Design a protein around this nucleic acid. Structure first.
Ligand SMILES: [Mg+2]
Ligand SMILES: [Mg+2]
Ligand SMILES: [Zn+2]
Lengths: 56, 99, 114, 139, 144, 158
RNA sequence: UUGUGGUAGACGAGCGUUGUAUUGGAGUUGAAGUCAAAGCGUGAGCAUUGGUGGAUCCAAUACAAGUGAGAAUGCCGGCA
RNA sequence: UUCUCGCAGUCAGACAGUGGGGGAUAAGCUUCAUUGUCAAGAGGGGAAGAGCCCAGAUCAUUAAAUAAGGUCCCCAAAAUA
RNA sequence: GCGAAACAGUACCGUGAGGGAAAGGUGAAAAGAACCCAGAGAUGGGAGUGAAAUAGAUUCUGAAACCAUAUGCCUACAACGUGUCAGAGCACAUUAAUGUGUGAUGGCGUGCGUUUUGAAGUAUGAGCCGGCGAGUUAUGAUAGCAAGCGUUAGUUAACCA
């Protein structure tokens, strides 16, 4: 099963219209200033007000 | 106030101070020309033609229309003849028409 | 001497490409398709230069019959009243345009009633 | 006042970097570094580093406002490619090709920053037409 | 060259109209409805600007069909499936849906076009005399 | 040619069952390696023939237009001497006679060596023997100085 | 006044290319090559200005051809 | 359209009307004869068609009169008895 | 142009005979970019040299195919060999021109070469772009046109200078 005619530069862009990306939810961690992505731990070591890791 | 005039083989519907393009007339720029052929000057119908009634016009320029690039192609049978053409016109406006 | 000939081919295909602009897809990019599209467009232009004078006459006929049906007579009857008596050489483009400035074309339709 | 920044031949495909290039383009500066560092893509860090470099450039060299900056233009042009062979069944030896991208970024300062480029374009065509009409004085 | 021909543009000015199919036949009502919708009777008919008036039909089910067409002439319609040919007769259609009958008899006579599916929506055929579009203050004329 | 470039008699492909062009040999005229199919050859004659009588008629007629075109100032063997090997005096004579921008031509019989030694570095001028001048070498001059006696010899030869 | 469709084909008239020979000429105040533009011819084609580029080039008459490219499952290179 | 000379191209034809052979007065079949078209012919009619009918396109024109064919709407044009 | 302008019969293929490529140019002279910022660094942005750094070692010129980004216009009831003749609306101003850019909407509209009686063809070839790619030459004969010499005409070959 092979293409019979050349798929033009228009159909390819139309197909790739949905291949766009999206940004993940971001939040400011407490007790320290950074933008971690939501529901995760920051590199700061705090998930909310709690100890889960070392400094970094 | 209006008029109908036969310039070349065409008929025009002119009013006072109208610029309308006709075919070539072999007339220098600025000369007053009297287009003799006429009918329906003002609510008067000259049946074949309107006799003794004249319209006086002054020409503006002798130009050339946009190029008509006509090329004929007998499909798949060895023919790609090419030709170009530029119809010359004479742009003229009316000044006053004799009754 | 040996001849390469780079300028001439480029100039020729550039002219052919330039003749076609606004075309969809690759037609305005590839000379090999641009020349065919120019041939077809010029064929269409040659055909329509006659078709348009074939068609504007019909358009005038239609916009004249529509006006005449508002006075109580058909287009076919009209020409006879022009030709056979009250002879006139009024073209069908002005016998149609005069309606756009009425109260003067009604003079035409009443004159033939004599 | 562009204070742009470029890099030559990153080992990533233009089509796979333009996806995040679109994500970042048009936004401010502070909300760009984090949103670019936090995406899970290979093209994330390779553009984040260049963006930090562009921030440093626009701050030090050209000396602009700083916080007024915002990512004006992002693209991922096709870089030079490397043509490599690959064994196949029954000995047919197709040819893979490793793509590359010449990533650039441009960071405006004033908010409009476009109609003046059109102003330069009109200045160019203006000088062309003025040179043309000047050449009519051959009499 | 010559005086460039005049064609009115975007000056469409259209009035509603009323006609009651008391004793009209299908074809002679349909032709007049179609060439009224097209704006064919206008003194200045620009052929690409939809210069045709609106139209409302009254008492469609009172239309008549000459001869024995009521029991012999069938109307057809097909879904894309197999055996989807829904065949109805003249007498059967008049009692159940007369409005669709006039709608199709008018839509057939319009040119295959893009304005055709825009002209055809300017017809509002009704089954009974009572209608809901009196808010437009339509005029009335006989046999059109 | 295709048969002279260092090429291979091998067919680069087989004739069939491999989908490509035919390409019987590598060094075909349409390949990039190239055997230029027609080209030039070093045996072209490039020569033309003109009848002796016709050529003599051409020489006589061109002498007829040139010798009577108020620029063929007669020169004498005396001033071929009286000049050293120096070419400075030659340009002095030329600017004296106002012939700086022309192509003056000397026809001669004895082919003196004082003059021939001079005028050598002057690209415009040239001295030729009476039998060394050709139609092109004469009508190109636009200015020449015939010397005294060759008039009789030219009359005899006509 | 008679005409002026046309494949195979027959004849005539021309354009363009590179070089050569004669005159003429232009060129770091920017040549050629390149791009752009709403220029001019019956057609092959030919100008004008601006950006780039930085050193040869143009016009008139003849002569000489490795002289005109869309197709050959053409070759080579690049990219879909 | 007769003669002399230079240079060719063609030796796979198709269809319509007409007269026949073969075929089964079957074939858009085959092979002759004759008149036309296409091949090498655009346009209008035929709903769409190289071969049917009216015709032979130098280009431009937003002018007029006609041929075949047509005049309820698509689609230009008609009525009267 | 020798296959080979350069470390070419090399790289590479073949057990072996043998087959057999591609590729050049900064600048006037390295005066090859000290020093600062970012980055781990390569590198990039400044600075400096330089007439020119959009001459920066990727190194004269840089076209097209192809890929991106943007000014203006249009497009999500539409049967489309994509154009053409009409045609608003919208935005501008030019080799001053009955201007350009786009084109809601109407009428019309089955590519290019091949070979065929007849091809849009459910025949055939081309993915696109660029370059290369096919009636020549030697010696004769024939015919046309023109030139020279001409009514015991015309004309040289090899060879010599
Ligand atoms: Mg196929
Ligand atoms: Mg996808
Ligand atoms: Zn934190």
């Amino acid at each position: 099963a092979v293409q019979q005619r050349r798929s033009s530069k228009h159909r390819r862009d139309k197909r790739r219209s949905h291949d766009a990306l999206t940004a993940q939810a971001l939040s400011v961690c407490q007790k320290c200033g950074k933008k971690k992505l939501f529901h995760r731990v920051c590199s700061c070591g705090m998930y909310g007000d709690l100890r889960v890791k070392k400094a970094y | 106030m209006h008029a109908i005039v036969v310039c070349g083989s065409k008929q025009y519907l002119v009013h006072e101070n109208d610029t309308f393009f006709v075919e070539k007339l072999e007339a220098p720029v600025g000369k007053e020309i009297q287009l003799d052929k006429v009918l329906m000057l003002d609510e008067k119908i000259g049946a074949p033609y309107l006799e003794k009634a004249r319209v006086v016009c002054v020409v503006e320029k002798h130009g050339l229309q946009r190029k008509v690039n006509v090329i004929k192609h007998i499909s798949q049978k060895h023919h790609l003849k090419k030709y170009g053409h530029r119809q010359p016109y004479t742009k003229l406006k009316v000044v006053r028409f004799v009754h | 001497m040996r001849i390469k000939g780079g300028k001439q081919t480029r100039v020729r295909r550039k002219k052919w490409l330039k003749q076609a602009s606004g075309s969809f897809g690759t037609r305005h990019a590839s000379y090999k398709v641009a020349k065919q599209t120019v041939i077809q467009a010029a064929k269409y232009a040659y055909r329509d230069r006659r078709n348009k004078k074939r068609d504007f006459r019909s358009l005038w006929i239609l916009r004249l019959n529509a006006a005449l049906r508002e006075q109580g007579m058909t287009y076919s009857v009209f020409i006879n009243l022009l030709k056979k008596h009250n002879i006139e050489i009024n073209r069908k483009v002005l016998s149609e345009l005069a309606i756009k400035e009425p109260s003067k074309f009604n003079l035409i339709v009443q004159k033939v009633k004599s | 006042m562009i204070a742009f920044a470029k890099q030559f031949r990153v080992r990533i495909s233009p089509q796979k970097a333009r996806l995040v290039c679109q994500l970042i383009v048009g936004k401010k500066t502070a909300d760009a570094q984090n949103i670019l560092s936090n995406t899970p893509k290979k093209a994330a860090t390779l553009i984040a580093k260049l963006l930090n470099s562009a921030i440093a450039n626009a701050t030090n060299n050209h000396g602009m406002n700083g916080d007024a900056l915002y990512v004006f233009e992002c693209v991922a042009n096709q870089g030079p490619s490397m043509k490599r062979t690959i064994p196949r069944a029954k000995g047919s030896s197709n040819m893979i090709t490793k793509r590359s991208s010449n990533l650039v970024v441009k960071l405006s300062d004033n908010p409009n920053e476009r109609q003046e480029l059109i102003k330069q374009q009109k200045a160019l065509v203006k000088k062309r037409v003025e040179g043309q009409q000047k050449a009519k004085m051959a009499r | 060259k010559t005086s460039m021909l005049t064609k009115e543009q975007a000056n469409k000015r259209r009035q509603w109209y009323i006609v009651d199919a008391a004793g009209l036949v299908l074809g002679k009502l349909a032709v007049k409805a179609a060439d009224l919708i097209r704006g064919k009777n206008k003194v200045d008919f620009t052929p690409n600007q939809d210069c045709g008036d609106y139209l409302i039909i009254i008492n469609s089910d009172q239309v008549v069909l000459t001869g024995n067409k009521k029991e012999n002439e069938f109307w057809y319609h097909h879904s894309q499936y197999i055996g989807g040919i829904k065949k109805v007769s003249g007498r059967d259609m008049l009692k159940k849906q007369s409005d669709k009958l006039v709608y199709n008899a008018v839509k057939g006579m319009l040119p295959d076009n893009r304005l055709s599916r825009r002209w055809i929506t300017k017809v509002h055929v009704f089954k009974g005399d009572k209608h809901n579009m009196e808010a437009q203050k339509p005029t009335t004329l006989n046999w059109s | 040619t295709k048969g002279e470039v260092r090429g291979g008699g091998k067919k680069p492909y087989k004739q069939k069952h491999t989908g490509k062009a035919r390409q019987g040999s590598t060094r075909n005229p349409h390949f990039v390696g190239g055997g230029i199919v027609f080209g030039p050859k070093p045996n072209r004659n490039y020569s033309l023939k003109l009848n002796k009588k016709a050529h003599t008629a051409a020489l006589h007629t061109v002498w007829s237009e040139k010798l009577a075109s108020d620029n063929t100032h007669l020169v004498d063997q005396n001033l071929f001497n009286k000049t050293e090997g120096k070419t400075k005096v030659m340009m002095q004579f030329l600017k004296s006679a106002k012939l700086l921008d022309k192509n003056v031509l000397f026809v001669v019989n004895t082919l003196n060596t004082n003059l021939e030694q001079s005028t050598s570095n002057i690209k415009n001028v040239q001295v030729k023997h009476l039998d060394k001048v050709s139609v092109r070498d004469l009508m190109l001059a636009n200015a020449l100085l015939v010397e005294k006696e060759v008039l009789k010899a030219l009359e005899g030869k006509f």
